[PDB]
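Holo prediction. Input below; ligand is 99E.
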Amino acid sequence: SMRKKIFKPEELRQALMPTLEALYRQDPESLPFRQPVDPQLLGIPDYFDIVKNPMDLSTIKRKLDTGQYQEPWQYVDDVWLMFNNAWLYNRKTSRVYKFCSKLAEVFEQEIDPVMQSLG
Ligand SMILES: CCc1c(C(=O)NCc2c(O)ccc3cccc(O)c23)[nH]c(C)c1C(C)=O
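Structure of the complex:
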């Protein structure tokens, strides 16, 4: 469409926060994603050489709380950025990679009816 529907901040928050909470509820799968990757603490100094645009659950939560999303696709894009970052950097045998794959399955399931409700 050429006429982008306007979403109120609280409309986006009420619709989308339950899908973020569904990711947070995955335990242990969400544990590596609840805070930004700290490459120095984690002993992986090559991280920012590979991941140019970091993203995590706490950043997305803050963006939802502060009205930084004007439409739901922006929120979906940030969640997918988090996923694609983990699938890019981590080896396929690693816990973070397999945990990412589980979160993406959960997010796909939860986000579909919500995007239909938002129109
Ligand atoms: C591997 C480092 C890393 C974490 C992380 O936080 N590792 C430390 C960690 C925890 O802080 C809590 C639970 C973990 C459960 C398994 C493996 C971990 O490592 C875990 N999160 C992301 C997105 C990455 C990368 C590079 O993509």
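The chain has five helices and no strands. That is the main takeaway for now.
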